[PDB]
Structures are given as structure tokens and as C-alpha cells.
Amino acid sequence: HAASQMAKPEDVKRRSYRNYGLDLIRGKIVDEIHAGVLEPTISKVKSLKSALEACVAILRIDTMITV
Amino acid sequence: KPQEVRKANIIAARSVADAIRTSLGPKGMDKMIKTSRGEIIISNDGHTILKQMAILHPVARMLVEVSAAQDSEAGDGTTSVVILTGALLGAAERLLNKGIHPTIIADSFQSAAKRSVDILLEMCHKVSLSDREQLVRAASTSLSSKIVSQYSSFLAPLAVDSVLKISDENSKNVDLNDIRLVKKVGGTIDDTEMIDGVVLTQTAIKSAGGPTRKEKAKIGLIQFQISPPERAYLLNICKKIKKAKCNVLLIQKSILRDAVNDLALHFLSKLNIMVVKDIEREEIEFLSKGLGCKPIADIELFTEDRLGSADLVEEIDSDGSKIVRVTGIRNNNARPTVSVVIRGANNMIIDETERSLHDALCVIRCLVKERGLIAGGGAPEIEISRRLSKEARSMEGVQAFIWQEFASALEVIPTTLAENAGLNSIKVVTELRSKHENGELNDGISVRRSGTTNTYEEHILQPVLVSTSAITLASECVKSILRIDDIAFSR
């Protein structure tokens, strides 16, 4: 994946170096567009956004009192 | 040993202050409170912290009285009156360790407060009762911490104009209990209905027979539940309400059954009397007050002199809202009742939104109570520290040494604001003082800018009452705690 950002200034690459992913069957790195692994955009957006709210809610709590 | 008594009183109160120290600011840290009723709550609201703290320490229960007094006095920044109290007590510990008798200490704090209020009056940014630019300006900036502050621009004239109508220009007092905010589901955040009179949360008769409105309406309050253990008995009860020609009837919510048996409800319909049910105790105190009427607990004690008068009584049902407004009271003993219906999306949203407007109503009252806007971000606390330090240089005696420690304690507010903002504490207060060496109101701790700038330019100003009462009420607490000589049980 790193090479997708390293060679981007060229706009012409040996490979796009994007849409590569983990093959959970054979244990190799494969292209997900050619392999067929797609995920919703709204899902990854909502996950990452809600993940911040979860982390902030915990990090914000600096005192606990028991009555 | 009274030194042991005072030691315990100071240590205990410091522990309460060290609990709230983290809560000041929009970036404040949250406190978790596990309650004895079995509910664990998490919030940054300061009065919520001390209210649910359930303080058992007799000395620290005075710190709750400080919070409530600050809320009933100004109604904003009640976190800071506890923090200010804590620093004055921590500085008092240093004074006690220096061997200064508490009486000398307390009277010196009294003289510091007298000078401190004057210092705030000097830096006052002048306001005016007609100045709706600054009134709307500051009020909406006090709403800036709320969930949707972009829709609060339209909530601004709701608070500003509604209070300017209820309050005279030359007036020293405004009653926030006479401004009732009522929520209602449906509409948008900028949509609110401000009524110049009492507003009834229920409508006419529930079953068929509801007249829904009255002209030349006389309003009585009969609160007692009417039901059979029957025809003549249940009917004759409401008949007399017709005898004196009372056209609107308010009935308190009963713990037994619904307001009235349908026999006397449909009879009140046959009497052409608009029937209003499920009125709350506090609603009677609100409703019967503005109307100028006296409530009657029972159904037997109906009289004539307690008849009301209402120009407009009609049911306001907007998209299925179902709330009644009554306007044009014209009662010699009444006051300008103001009631607002808060429209919005979700029941939970409008419930909290109403509370966000209660905060704003306190802001405008603070400006009517005492005219002036003061820099936020703890800027007045740095400025006061410099002036009292300058005056302590010419002051002579142990009174000067205590005045100096007062100035050190004034840093707890700008220090707490900087710590909870994540800026180097010494770096910030150093820069605050350097800037106050040149400017006056040009300074303040800015969360957005991560530095020192003019909160006036950042649109962050606070009523001078908030700062004045914060110092004033704090000196009363310092006296109260330092004057505790022994703790005894009574039985």
C-alpha cells in the first residue's frame, strides 16, 4: 500500500498499488477488485466516526466517585 | 484542640475542590458518579457533580450552599465559585501555617473582596438595555457550547426580546420563574412560540363536550378528584362553578383517577365551562399567579371573588401539538407572564434544548441585574491579581501579606482553564500577565486560538454579575469555613 503514495507524484505506476488486501484463504496479498472484496462506504465512514466518539468518551472520564 | 478542628475543615473542603478542578471549560474532563439509587452518571455539569456528590461531610455541605447561591444569584459559571472557594481555602492553609489567627485572616479577605468588586467595576464593558446588538451577541455566544449552535442564532431573539419585554429598562430585578419554557414535539430548533400570558399544558374536556375556547372567560382552580364512591352528587359539585359563571376550570393531576367522572365533565360541557385537567402543583403556582387567582384545594370551597378574567382562551394545536394559550389577563395584581413553547424534532432533543435556553435566560437577567460585559477566559482574574498585588505593595502590615496571598489564589481560574485546555500552565499565565501589562480587556484564555487574545474579539463575554458574585459569595464561604470552631451532635 505504501507505494501507492510514494509513486503517486508520477500518476503512472508499475501498479496502482491500491485495492490490495488480505486473502483470508490462501494467506497472500491480493487485489480486492480482481478478487471481489467490496465494503460499503457508509459503513467504514460510520465505523471510524463512531470509533472516535467511543474513544473520546472514555478518555474524557478522569474522575470516578462511588456513593 | 481547635487547630485540629480547622485542619479537618480545610482538608475536607480542599478534597471537594480538587474533584471539580478538572471540569472547568468546554474541553473539561468528565466525572463519573455511582449513585446510591443504582445509577451511574457521567457529566461535566458542575452543579450536577455537587448535587449528586451526596456530600456527607458536614463542613463540605456548605460548598453545596455556595453552588446553589451562585446559581440563584447569577446562574452561570457555578463551577467557578467552587474552584474559587478551593483556592482561597488552599491559600488560607498557607496563612494558617504562617500562624495568622483565622479572625485576622477572614477580615483581610473581607477587605480584599471590597477592593475586588471595585476592580471589576473598572474593567466593565458598558452595555445598555436597548442594545439588542450586544444582548443578542453575548446570549448566542453563551449558547455556543450547545449541540446545534447554528440554530441558536434564531433562539437568540427568543431569549433577548422576551426578557426585555418582561423587564423594565430601569429595573434591578427579573424573575426567571415568571418566564416558563415549555417543550413541544414537532417543528424546528429555530421555531419557538413566545406567549405574553399563561399557557396551559392540557386542552378542554378530554371526552366529547370540550368547548375548546371561551370569551369573557373567568378562570377557577378546583383541584380535587371527582368520581363516584352518584348522579346528583357528582353533577351538583360542578353546578356551582356555573353559578358564579366560571368559564375555564383547571384541575390538579390526581393520584387516584382521571380528573372528573364523565358525568360532571359532560355536565361541565352542558354548563359551557372549559375544563382543563392534569395541572401540576408548580403549574398552579405559575398559572394562578399570573392570572391573579387563588387556587382552591377542594370542590366544596368554590367562591365568587376568586373568579379570573381572560381575553383570549383558545387551543393551539399545530401538527398535533395540543397546548392551550391564554392571553390578555389584565389583572391589577398580576405580573407580565411570559411562557414559551419550544418546537423541535425529538422529545429528548427538545427536553435538553429547553434547558439550554434556561441557561440563556440567566445571562440576560445578569445583564439587567447589573449592566456590563466582562472578558471571558479568566482574563478578569489575571487583571484583578495584578491590581491587588499593586495595591498590596503600598498596603502595610499583616493585612498586606494576606492581600498578597489572595492574589495568588486568583490564579486558580486562569490556571484551571489553561490546564483543561492542554497548554503549559506556566507558559500561559506568564503570557497572560505579560499581555495584561499592556492591555486590559484585550486578554483571555482562548480554546480556539490556543493562546492569549481578546475574548471580545472572540465573542466570549460574560456578565459582570457573574464575576462580581463569584468573588463576593466566595468571601462568604471562606469566612464560614474559617469560623468553624468545633463540631457537636445534637439530640
| Domain range list for chain B | 1-127+372-491, 128-196+336-371, 197-335
> For residue A29, what is its C-alpha cell?
496479498
**Which residue in chain A has the smallest CA separation from B35?**
A67
> For residue B313, what is its C-alpha cell?
382562551
Given an 8 Å threshold on Cβ–Cβ distance, is A67 in contact with B29?
no
Nearest by CB to residue B33, choosing from A57, A60, A65, is A65
Q: Are strands A29-31 and A61-66 parallel, antiparallel or unpaired?
A: unpaired
The helix (H) or strand (E) run that includes residue B173 is none
> For residue B79, what is its C-alpha cell?
463551577
Output the CATH code of domain B1-127+372-491.
1.10.560.10
Burial class (CB in 10 A: 0-12, 13-18, 19+), A19: middle
Burial class (CB in 10 A: 0-12, 13-18, 19+), B442: middle
Q: Which phi-psi region, left, alpha or beta, contains residue B272 (left: φ > 0; alpha: ψ -120 to 50)?
A: left
Residues in chain B: 491
Among residues B85, B96, B35, the alpha carbon closest in space to that of B62 is found at B85
Active site includes B327? no
Residues of A in CB contact (< 8 Å) with B are: 57, 60-67
Residue B97 contacts A, CB cutoff 8 Å: no
The span from the CA of B268 to the CA of B262, in Å, is 9
Residue for grid cell 481578546: B454
Active site includes B78? yes
Alpha-carbon distance B30 to nearest alpha carbon in chain A (angstroms): 5
The helix (H) or strand (E) run that includes residue B42 is strand B40-43
Q: Which phi-psi region, left, alpha or beta, contains residue B397 (left: φ > 0; alpha: ψ -120 to 50)?
A: left
Residue for grid cell 371561551: B214
Core vs surface per residue B69-82: b (16+ CB within 10 A) or e:
bbbebbbbbbbbbb
**Which residue in chain B has the smallest CA separation from A67?**
B35
The span from the CA of B426 to the CA of B438, in Å, is 19
Residue for grid cell 370540550: B210
Active site includes B359? yes
Measured CA to CA in angstroms, residue B427 lies from B108, B380, B415, B438, B482 at distances of 30, 18, 10, 17, 33
Nearest by CB to residue A60, choosing from B19, B30, B35, is B30
Distance from the Cα of residue B151 to its chain's centroid: 22
| Rg from Cα positions in chain B | 27
Give the Cβ contact number of residue B481 at 10 Å: 24
Alpha-carbon distance A44 to nearest alpha carbon in chain B (angstroms): 24
The span from the CA of B384 to the CA of B118, in Å, is 10
**Architecture field, domain B197-335:** 3-Layer(bba) Sandwich (3.50)
Nearest by CB to residue A63, choosing from B32, B35, B54, is B32
Active site includes B45? yes
| Rg from Cα positions in chain A | 19
Dihedral sign for Cα B1, B4, B10, B15, please.
Answer: negative
Report the residue of A59, A60, A63, A66 to disrupt the B interface, i.e. the one with the largest count of B CBs within 10 Å: A63
HSE (CB half, 13 Å, CA atoms) of B28?
Answer: 23
Amino acid identity, position A17: Y
Nearest by CB to residue A62, choosing from B30, B36, B54, is B30
**Which residue in chain B has the smallest CA separation from A60?**
B29
> For residue B476, what is its C-alpha cell?
462568604
Q: Which phi-psi region, left, alpha or beta, contains residue B295 (left: φ > 0; alpha: ψ -120 to 50)?
A: beta
What's the resolution in A?
A: 4.1
The span from the CA of B345 to the CA of B356, in Å, is 15
Domains B1-127+372-491 and B197-335 share a fold: no
Q: Are B180 and B338 in contact (CB under 8 A)?
A: yes
Given an 8 Å threshold on Cβ–Cβ distance, is A67 in contact with B54?
yes
Query: Nearest-5° angle of CA B121, CA B124, CA B125?
Result: 165
Q: Are B426 and B440 in contact (CB under 8 A)?
A: no
Nearest by CB to residue B29, choosing from A60, A65, A67, is A60
Among residues B383, B372, B367, B366, the alpha carbon closest in space to that of B442 is found at B383
Query: Nearest-5° angle of CA B407, CA B410, CA B411?
Result: 105
Measured CA to CA in angstroms, residue B378 lies from B9, B67, B81, B466 at distances of 28, 19, 13, 12
Residue B30 contacts A, CB cutoff 8 Å: yes
Contacts with B490 (C-beta within 8 Å, 6 or more apart), sequence order: none
The span from the CA of B223 to the CA of B250, in Å, is 7
How many beta-carbon contacts under 8 Å exist across A and B?
36
The span from the CA of B241 to the CA of B303, in Å, is 8
- A-proximal residues of B, 43-72, CB under 8 Å: 52-54
**Which residue in chain B has the smallest CA separation from A61?**
B30
Measured CA to CA in angstroms, residue B435 lies from B185, B291, B382, B476 at distances of 49, 54, 10, 31
Q: Are B27 and B445 in contact (CB under 8 A)?
A: no
In the three-class reduction of DSSP (H, G, I as helix; E, B as strand; rest coil), residue B30 is classed as: strand
Residue for grid cell 483581610: B108
How would DSSP label each residue in B397-413?
A: SHHHHHHHHHHHHTTHH
How would DSSP label each residue in A13-36?
A: -SS---SEEE-TTT-SEEEHHHHT
Beta pairing partners, B260? B226
Structure-solving method: cryo-EM
Residue for grid cell 394562578: B288
Residue B34 contacts A, CB cutoff 8 Å: yes
HSE (CB half, 13 Å, CA atoms) of B414?
Answer: 31
Given an 8 Å threshold on Cβ–Cβ distance, is A67 in contact with B42?
no
